[PDB]
Design a protein around this ligand. Structure first.
Ligand SMILES: CCCCCCCCCCCC
Ligand SMILES: CCCCCCCCCCCC
Ligand SMILES: CCCCCCCCCCCC
Length: 625
């Protein structure tokens, strides 16, 4: 009977005070792991040079920087050694946030066809989102926890007990039942938050007192309350009425859509924002910045999955406020997705938000397709924001548009649905499903371009206090050896030989996966040492000036998996001009991939090869040659 979509018996933040600290690897282990990852990428001569640099680093400056890093960590046990430096890196970056960083996740349709009406779904998705906001702020959202055995740890029985254990010892309680609570310090930024462009480093802004929603349609800005001053969610039928009002607006797109500015270089946008304020738009900008989130209503249907990906990843530049913590998008055909700003968090908060909202809006919708909009004066409740644009601002919007169109025109995206099998078949073959997907990417790249390249796979270290992410390096001596066998020398190898090579890839990949989740990767450690060197005003150590290091950090193959019943498709642009941005998901009986590329690479051809490699892998696993 309330506005909460969850009623946790355990306070949302119950485990935060007792989360284990993010460990720092021993310098000896990091150097060894760094070298292991370089083995498949460097030729003998390059490797020798790099190995020598590592030896020197470990005994010289590296040893010194590591000591300082440990000393610093001890003085800040309330956080992690990597969180601050990581935020600093992204807030300082001056590149456009569109494509370079902002990703998207698209919702599956409501199982009930009729409920996918734009007005209906925009209303239900919006109401569920505010219900999430209320639930989170009330501490009634179930604590984020990773269960190894849900049937024993994620039960009311355990909940009734841990609930009495003090926050200072709660983590241990879950630990005993093989449950791992996660960090939730970023979750508050899901709402009333935005990224503000500033001269050298951007700032993350949040106004927890704001109660209005920002809606974008045909480039126009609208705001209206979704939470009243009493703290209750505005009547769903009234919200429906205001959205119907917005959807009825016949005003044409503005000649100069202001939203384009959020896609600019950060220094350029920072200055243009200053002028916007100098020209009297501060009040308007404050309304935009503080809205609970941004709801975008596109006036067109999705033509194909490719069109959907483009629409949710970047759109046409006029109807998305890229700086907002997130943009909830709902197209004419009801297709919905969440486009979010990268810098404020690691996206776990967004996924949780995403799953809860999908569940709540499809299982307990606020309104139905037959619901009657409540009587109300929408023209009074809904304010159309206006921007006083000077000649310099219009020129600025024009330039932003040309820069946007120029970049977007080079982006290509496509997907595949491998339906011969998934987790079930692979697990029976006693192989890691994730390791197999990664092996396929390596094999496809070798077949398409004839080389082994720097590969990145995202992993979470959210099991630790202020944990963030760590890098899993799937390109190994094993995947290289295996790919060469499948691609170069087929036949010359027996099916048995191919099977054991894949087993070797899977085993090593599992090792790297566990180490990464435990903060035992080498990337964050090496980055933190470099960040500290720079902070100390010290010269960049030769280890980092090594071409091998730069190459290890030019991730041609960027990947991240996403597993969720609420997610239909997801994606992100490549992180380097000649790279691929690979979002994939291994399901029980099939495998899906959504791949992006710029002019330099061919996503469509790559996927063809990925399909081919997955078929070859499945054949070999079935005893076929
Ligand atoms: C101990 C490992 C916990 C991992 C928790 C799930 C992380 C999912 C990240 C999703 C990012 C979109
Ligand atoms: C949201 C999907 C992210 C996939 C992984 C991208 C990793 C890029 C790291 C770049 C470091 C310089
Ligand atoms: C059936 C709905 C569309 C599925 C398209 C294939 C999967 C694309 C990759 C998803 C990665 C999260």
């Amino acid at each position: 009977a309330d506005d909460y979509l969850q009623h946790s018996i355990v306070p949302t933040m119950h485990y935060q005070d007792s989360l284990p600290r993010l460990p720092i690897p021993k310098l000896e282990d990091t150097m060894k792991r760094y070298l292991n990852a370089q083995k498949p990428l460097l030729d003998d001569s390059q490797f020798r040079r790099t190995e020598a640099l590592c030896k020197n680093f470990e005994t010289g400056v590296g040893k010194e920087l590591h000591a300082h890093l440990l000393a610093q960590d001890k003085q800040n046990k309330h956080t992690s050694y990597i969180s601050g430096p990581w935020f600093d890196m992204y807030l300082t970056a001056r590149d456009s946030i569109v494509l370079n960083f902002n990703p998207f996740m698209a919702f599956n349709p409501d199982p009930k066809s009729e409920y996918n009406d734009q007005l209906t779904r925009a209303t239900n998705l919006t109401v569920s989102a505010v219900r999430f906001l209320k639930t989170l702020q009330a501490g009634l959202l179930e604590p984020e926890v990773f269960h190894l055995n849900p049937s024993k740890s994620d039960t009311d029985a355990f909940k009734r007990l841990i609930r009495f254990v003090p926050p200072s010892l709660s983590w241990y309680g879950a630990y005993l039942v093989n449950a791992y609570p996660l960090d939730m310090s970023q979750y508050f930024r899901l709402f009333n938050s935005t990224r503000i462009p500033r001269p050298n480093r951007d700032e993350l802004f949040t106004d927890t007192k704001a109660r209005h929603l920002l809606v974008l349609r045909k480039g126009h800005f609208y705001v209206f309350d979704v939470l009243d001053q009493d703290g209750n969610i505005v009547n769903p039928l009234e919200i429906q009425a205001h959205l119907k009002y917005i959807l009825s607006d016949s005003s044409p797109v503005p000649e100069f859509p202001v939203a384009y500015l959020t896609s600019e270089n950060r220094d350029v946008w920072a200055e243009l924002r200053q002028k916007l304020i100098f020209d009297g738009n501060e009040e308007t900008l404050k309304k935009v910045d503080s809205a609970v989130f941004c709801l975008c209503l596109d006036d067109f249907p999705m033509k194909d999955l490719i069109h959907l990906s483009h629409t949710m990843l970047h759109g046409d530049g006029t109807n998305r406020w890229f700086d907002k913590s997130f943009n909830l998008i709902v197209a004419e055909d009801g297709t919905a997705a969440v486009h979010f700003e990268h810098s404020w968090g690691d996206g776990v908060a967004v996924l949780r938000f995403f799953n809860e909202v999908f569940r709540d809006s499809t299982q307990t919708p606020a309104i139905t397709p037959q619901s009657q909009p409540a009587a109300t004066n929408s023209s009074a409740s809904v304010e159309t924001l206006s921007f006083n644009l000077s000649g310099a601002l219009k020129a600025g919007i024009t330039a932003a548009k040309e820069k946007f169109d120029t970049t977007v025109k080079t982006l290509s995206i496509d997907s595949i649905q491998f339906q011969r099998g998934g987790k079930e078949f692979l697990k029976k073959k006693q192989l890691s499903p994730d390791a197999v997907a990664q092996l396929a990417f390596q094999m496809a790249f070798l077949r398409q371009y004839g080389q082994t390249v720097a590969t990145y796979e995202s992993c979470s270290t959210a099991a630790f206090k202020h944990g963030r992410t760590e890098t899993i390096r799937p390109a190994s001596i094993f995947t290289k050896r295996c790919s060469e066998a499948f691609v170069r020398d087929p036949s010359k190898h027996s099916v048995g030989e191919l099977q054991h090579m894949m087993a070797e890839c899977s085993k090593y990949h599992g090792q790297l996966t566990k180490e990464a989740t435990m903060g035992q990767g080498f990337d964050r450690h090496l980055y933190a040492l470099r960040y500290l060197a720079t902070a100390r005003g010290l010269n960049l150590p030769e280890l980092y000036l090594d071409p091998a290091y730069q190459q290890m950090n030019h991730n041609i193959l960027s990947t991240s998996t996403l597993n969720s019943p609420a997610v239909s498709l997801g994606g992100f642009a490549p992180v380097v001009p000649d790279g691929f941005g690979i979002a994939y998901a291994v399901h029980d009986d099939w495998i899906g991939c959504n791949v992006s590329s710029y002019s330099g690479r061919n996503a469509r051809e790559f996927l063809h090869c990925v399909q081919k490699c997955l078929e070859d892998i499945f054949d070999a696993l079935e005893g076929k040659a």
